[PDB]
Structures are given as structure tokens and as C-alpha cells.
Amino acid sequence: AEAELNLPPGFRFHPTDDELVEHYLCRKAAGQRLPVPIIAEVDLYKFDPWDLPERALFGAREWYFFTPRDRSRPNRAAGNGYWKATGADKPVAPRGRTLGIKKALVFYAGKAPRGVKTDWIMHEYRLADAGRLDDWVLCRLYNKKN
Amino acid sequence: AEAELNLPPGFRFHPTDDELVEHYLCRKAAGQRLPVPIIAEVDLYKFDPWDLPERALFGAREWYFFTPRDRSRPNRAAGNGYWKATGADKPVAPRGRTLGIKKALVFYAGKAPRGVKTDWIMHEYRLADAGRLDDWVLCRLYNKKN
């Protein structure tokens, strides 16, 4: 939607875990210029997931945000519901002593534990004692039934 | 590997079905210039899949070839083995009266039916009476355990 501002057909943003952490999350936490300004900044955990694509700077099937928060926890309260951890923190280990951590979540609309599973999924990527701060995480959102 | 000749990190070839058919297979069968010259041409069904990435013009996890052949069939003999259909032809219907067909295959090394399943997968994309010829198909190859 502004990954539209350059490319030949079939080319699009489809980073690896090493790339998301190394050239996006890392740089934002080090106050480095991003390779391109395509990740929207939002107070994400204040939202219901269906109000999120709003709002993203690009994307049709999946969306990318910089939000404030994490530093390991099953769950993450948000909007009029909560996110529930779908797996374990997964080490993401770029070249340096840089260390990322991705975790997968599912939104439940409603207050715990009487919440109901939706098809909204999120991958939260946090700098997990890498090096570069707290402070920012980088999230990829999307619905299972696209 | 030469999708390397341009782009910002996390950007790469990751086309949709509509895009593969519309701007790649279609153009090759109409003798139109490709948006970029990144699809290798090979006599694919003469090969064993592990000799294919050779050979591709780019790619680390998945690979794209233009090969001669199809026009619907469970199976496709190839190399010292055969490909076996993993599902049904799937309509791919870009904007025009253009109509593609993707089908999914699994290689079995060995002669039928005493062949043994490998983790090589292939998506064959053929122009299925679209419009533009026979003649070329467009294949995406990759191993399940990357």
C-alpha cells in the first residue's frame, strides 16, 4: 500500500526473522535510520486487532507495527480482550551478539478467562538483551482466514 | 541471489498466484518482456529436484523455473523418479479472461510405483486455456525441511 512506492510485480516485504530483528527492530532501538519507513508506530496493546490494519502503513494480508511494551510472559492484555501466547519465545540470532525473541499470540475478544478465540494472530518481536533498549517491540499482525 | 541486484532488506520475490500467472507465465507465453529476468529456463522434467537449485537464477529457500510441458494429470515423470500430484488443479484467475492453473506435486525418487517420497515440493503453474500457448509452464520448487 506504499511498499507500492517502488517495486516490480511479485516483489514485496517478506523479511526473515533475522532481517526483521537485524535491520528493523535493532535500528529503531539504536536510533538508526530504518532501511525504509514502512513500519507504523502505534500504541498497539490499546487496540482490538480488527482496528489495527487501519493504521498500518502498507499491506493487504499482513501488517507491521512498532509499539511500546515487552522486555517473556504468557499473554498480553489489549483493547477489549487479550492476546494469548501460542508457543514459546523463539530465539532469533542475527550475526552480532544481537539477540531477538519472537513469540506468537492469538487474540481473544472478551475479558479473561471468559474470552473467545478470534482468527487474529500476532508475532511479537522484542530485543531480548541484544546489542538496544526496552521499549519498542515489532509486531506482525494478520487474520488466519485472510 | 540476484533478486540481490536492487532491493532494501526484507524485500524479495514473494508473488501471489495472480501475479505469477498474470505478469510472468502470461508474458512468457505471449512473447512479452518479463518485468524482470529472474526465472531460469530449464528442461525441468529431465531433472532430479536436488539438482535443480543449481541452476535457478536466485533464491535460498525456494526456486523458480520456466520449463516445457503441460497443457491436467495426476503425476509427471522426471529424472530418476517421478512427481505425484498432491491436490487438484487450482484455478488462478487474474483480471482478464486470463486463466491459470496451479497444481502441487511431491517427488518420489525411484520408478513407479516403487518410488520413495522425498521432501521436494513443486507448484506447477500452467496456462489453462487463458488469453497464451502450450508450451511453457512456470514452476516453484522447494524442500519441506528447508
Side-chain angles (χ1 to χ4, degrees):
Chain A
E2 76 86 12
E4 261 246 70
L5 320 183
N6 7 239
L7 305 153
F11 284 84
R12 57 173 38 80
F13 191 64
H14 178 61
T16 58
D17 286 8
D18 274 19
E19 288 163 356
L20 265 187
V21 173
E22 200 186 322
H23 319 98
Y24 297 85
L25 183 56
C26 233
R27 312 249 244 185
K28 184 70 160 202
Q32 230 131 30
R33 179 73 307 250
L34 292 234
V36 278
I38 52 171
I39 322 285
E41 305 152 312
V42 66
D43 197 349
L44 194 142
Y45 296 99
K46 311 275 163 139
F47 284 85
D48 280 327
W50 50 84
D51 297 316
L52 273 174
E54 233 75 321
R55 235 178 233 282
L57 300 180
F58 69 103
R61 26 221 193 106
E62 67 169 13
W63 308 273
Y64 289 92
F65 311 79
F66 273 125
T67 170
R69 245 292 187 77
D70 235 32
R71 215 248 85 185
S72 185
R73 247 138 311 234
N75 286 32
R76 247 138 277 217
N80 303 296
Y82 59 90
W83 294 95
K84 169 177 292 292
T86 241
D89 303 338
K90 171 173 297 59
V92 178
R95 291 139 136 82
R97 42 251 77 80
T98 311
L99 193 257
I101 290 185
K102 106 141 109 172
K103 150 108 102 287
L105 304 143
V106 225
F107 189 81
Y108 284 80
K111 194 215 58 206
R114 67 154 69 59
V116 45
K117 196 162 180 158
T118 65
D119 290 345
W120 291 95
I121 310 307
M122 172 166 296
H123 296 171
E124 193 205 80
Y125 290 84
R126 69 183 193 263
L127 275 181
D129 315 32
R132 135 242 227 180
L133 238 258
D134 249 16
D135 215 20
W136 288 107
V137 301
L138 162 32
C139 292
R140 166 208 284 123
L141 171 89
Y142 72 81
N143 205 270
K144 272 197 64 169
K145 291 179 179 179
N146 348 222
Chain B
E2 76 86 12
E4 261 246 70
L5 320 183
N6 7 239
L7 305 153
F11 284 84
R12 57 173 38 80
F13 191 64
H14 178 61
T16 58
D17 286 8
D18 274 19
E19 288 163 356
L20 265 187
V21 173
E22 200 186 322
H23 319 98
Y24 297 85
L25 183 56
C26 233
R27 312 249 244 185
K28 184 70 160 202
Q32 230 131 30
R33 179 73 307 250
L34 292 234
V36 278
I38 52 171
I39 322 285
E41 305 152 312
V42 66
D43 197 349
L44 194 142
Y45 296 99
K46 311 275 163 139
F47 284 85
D48 280 327
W50 50 84
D51 297 316
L52 273 174
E54 233 75 321
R55 235 178 233 282
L57 300 180
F58 69 103
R61 26 221 193 106
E62 67 169 13
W63 308 273
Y64 289 92
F65 311 79
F66 273 125
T67 170
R69 245 292 187 77
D70 235 32
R71 215 248 85 185
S72 185
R73 247 138 311 234
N75 286 32
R76 247 138 277 217
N80 303 296
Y82 59 90
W83 294 95
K84 169 177 292 292
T86 241
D89 303 338
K90 171 173 297 59
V92 178
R95 291 139 136 82
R97 42 251 77 80
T98 311
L99 193 257
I101 290 185
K102 106 141 109 172
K103 150 108 102 287
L105 304 143
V106 225
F107 189 81
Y108 284 80
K111 194 215 58 206
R114 67 154 69 59
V116 45
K117 196 162 180 158
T118 65
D119 290 345
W120 291 95
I121 310 307
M122 172 166 296
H123 296 171
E124 193 205 80
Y125 290 84
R126 69 183 193 263
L127 275 181
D129 315 32
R132 135 242 227 180
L133 238 258
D134 249 16
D135 215 20
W136 288 107
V137 301
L138 162 32
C139 292
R140 166 208 284 123
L141 171 89
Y142 72 81
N143 205 270
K144 272 197 64 169
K145 291 179 179 179
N146 348 222

